Subunit: 273 residues, 4 copies
């Protein structure tokens, strides 16, 4: 009877803020994580403490690789598609529903054209394309099938899919090609899924941050200079300044919106060198 949100990469930063923002609205939240088990279980505890049985954690590698079956007798590697189906399944198993999907998990590191390895280049392609593009596709598919399979009478009235894209990829970041192409893929998914799932009343939108919760592992004057180029406030956003938009888009007040993106970027994309 309570709406259910699945949030990938939910353990920290903008994914946490999204899970939290949805939770404040009344959602039960499936918190996905890959490597951040401690932070995800802690976040779950906070949410459950405020409202019993309003959170769970599920672990999955969203890289475009087949994982190992759980080396022994009777099985076959688990495809990304299956791990994605199981994520959505986790929501139906536990709460009997899934109303909101947020595709937030994403790897982000350089793949330069101009310059051990083989494994680097192979793994990077799978990981960056998986997390940013191919997993969202399969996740959206599982999500869609399970609404299609729900008798109209038992269906939700506010199905929403949010894809976290990037406001800045038309102005690409030097050396981040695979990432950038993956976000471009994700933007196509938004449009194409919004079109094909319209008859089911599944809305599909994007939210593209500019600079948000900027990692500060660098000279302060450099961190500071990066920041200062956002026209608005001359700083990166907080997590909530992004997650609040995600929340609105999922609200029944946004039910005519589909197939679109909202940049949250402090006018950063308006800039030129």
């Amino acid at each position: 009877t309570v709406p259910v949100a699945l949030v990938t990469g939910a353990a920290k930063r903008l994914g946490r803020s999204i899970a939290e923002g949805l939770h404040a609205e009344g959602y039960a939240v499936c918190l996905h994580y890959h490597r951040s088990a401690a932070e995800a279980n802690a976040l779950s505890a906070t949410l459950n403490a405020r409202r019993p049985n309003s959170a769970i954690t599920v672990q999955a590698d969203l890289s475009n690789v087949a994982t190992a079956p759980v080396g022994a007798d009777g099985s076959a590697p688990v495809t990304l598609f299956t791990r994605c189906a199981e994520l959505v399944a986790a929501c139906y198993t536990h709460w009997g529903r899934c109303d909101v999907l947020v595709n937030n998990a994403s790897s982000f590191y350089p793949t330069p054209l101009l310059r051990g390895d083989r494994e680097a280049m192979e793994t990077a392609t799978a990981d960056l394309f998986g997390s940013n593009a191919i997993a969202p596709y399969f996740l959206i598919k599982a999500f869609a099938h399970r609404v299609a399979g729900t008798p109209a009478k038992h269906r939700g009235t506010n199905y929403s899919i949010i894809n976290m894209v990037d406001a800045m990829t038309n102005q690409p970041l030097l050396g981040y090609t695979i990432y950038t192409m993956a976000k471009g893929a994700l933007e196509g998914l938004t449009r194409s899924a919004a079109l094909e799932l319209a008859p089911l009343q599944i809305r599909v939108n994007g939210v593209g941050p500019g600079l948000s919760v900027l990692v500060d592992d660098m000279p302060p004057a450099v961190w500071e200079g990066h920041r200062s180029k956002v026209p608005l406030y001359q700083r990166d956003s907080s997590a909530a300044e992004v997650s609040d938009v995600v929340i609105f888009l999922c609200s029944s007040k946004a039910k005519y919106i589909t197939g679109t993106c909202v940049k949250v970027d402090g006018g950063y994309s308006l800039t030129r060198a």
Copy 2:
């Protein structure tokens, strides 16, 4: 500290729903109208009944023309006077919604009406907005930083569908392209004053039953209908809320996936 919204073309349809939506969030509302005096006054009455002194009306032709006093008055002056009306009455203006807009054909293919059409469609949709944003920014720049609002917001009502131009509506389409440029340019220049500038583009919203009505309706992917006024205004209201304080220079399409379509 009641914040003040100026909404152009506020008397009916989407402008009314925006005035109402902002009113419900606590704004005092300057309702601009041109010809729809009766409807604007009635709406002001509703809002004032709910909350005393929370609404006024001001009349202005937003066409790019000079008018008379019975000095012809230029569009720039009428625009400045709109923003000034807000300061005179409540001593502030926090929100501006550029909503008023003419919309009729200017076919390229089968000089009196040509020029008045140009002035009207360009003025309402583009030039008046520019002047309004100018007046708005000047009043803020002139307010000592101590006494400034904390959530200045300008929303331009654009069009989701103008990349897929409506046949025979060239001037209108160009004016909306001009408005999109104003959104980006104003968002950049006013950032240092923390004035956010965004657009909202409806697709098909609140169709008068021109008969065919079912024709257009039926190729909106989402729901196969046009939107209600609130389905648009709610987005406007969000964009004006402090929760949307990192958003500037951008547009939100409210079109039910309509722009995703092809012939």
Copy 3:
């Protein structure tokens, strides 16, 4: 012998476009506003290489009234431009909307008349004159009996690669270019049945009158005039006959940059 009308033809890109079209065989109507000397000299060069292959026509393209029956509107001056082509050579196959004022209209200081002249000048040259010119052009074609019509009608609007990344203080200019982009799309749709193609070409930084230069990813300079005009010429060629309603950025990657 096809005819091109080129607004703002006296110097810089307008001149390189006139020249580039002339080298392809076009007769060229060179429009100018103030640059009479330069336009007449250019016309002399072109006529010397090929007799009667160029003329000059003067018009303020600002959205004002000027000079006489009674005040002459922008619409009329625009019609007269296209008419000059038909009168002299009995045709007009290519239109290039190139003429364009470009100067600041700040929202924040750092009155009035300067603003109401600026509005009419920047919107007129960049957007309103183009519309009327496109209108005049389309009517002359619609009125030509089909068997007597050209086979490669082309309109090119000079837009701006960089206006999604607005130049600080240039709001009316930017809005006018956004207006011109809509004209491109709208005219391309409505004139398709007459086989009039309508496209845009957007320079980044071209022929600067260096800080800015060094910011361009490709070559770290501004373009030459020909680096822009050659694109225009291609779009006008029969090889480009399936292209309409689109823009080409000629910007050296400049619009790919961020601050």
Copy 4:
């Protein structure tokens, strides 16, 4: 002395016309193919007949799969390896590669929604993404590497990369999600590679057809019905109407253009339902 173009999926339709159009401008042309051996060899023969040693054919599956071991004896060949060998082929035979056209592309439905069912699935993802996006990336990588490796004194003066994108993908075709995502990934690559390869004076641009040489495998009236939708001419383009734009972009006349797309669609993207 003679500039060299590599054209992927060159055997037929738009890729043949591109190879032909480059050939007419003086290029030697590496014509890659996958399943169309006969057409590619026949096209090579025409080009060689017209100008001796001005064409070669080379075969590669550009699907994102590992392939042809040394019956085997050993290790699987990576897509990246096959891609590098394509560009290598050009250097081995003619000592250069000036132009790369990423034209090969698979195109068939991947519906979100229902009514070889997971090999099909898996092979669709690798094939659509591979041909349309991942192989282009690796090809662009190999190409840039060989230029970077060329002493500036032995470097060509007109290096050009063209990615065949799609004018219509912002108006997505119902049921072709993966294809659409893949083209959005290719658009990312265009922008990103244009930025990163600028310092080596490698230009990187896209050309997006609307409807070109439309397959007529359907009731005439339905075929006529589809073309009739194009506002310009009410027909699909010919192959040359597309390839001539490609050729222009590669010409020295286009040397200031990089990081952009050119729609060749007859105004088709300007339409709405």
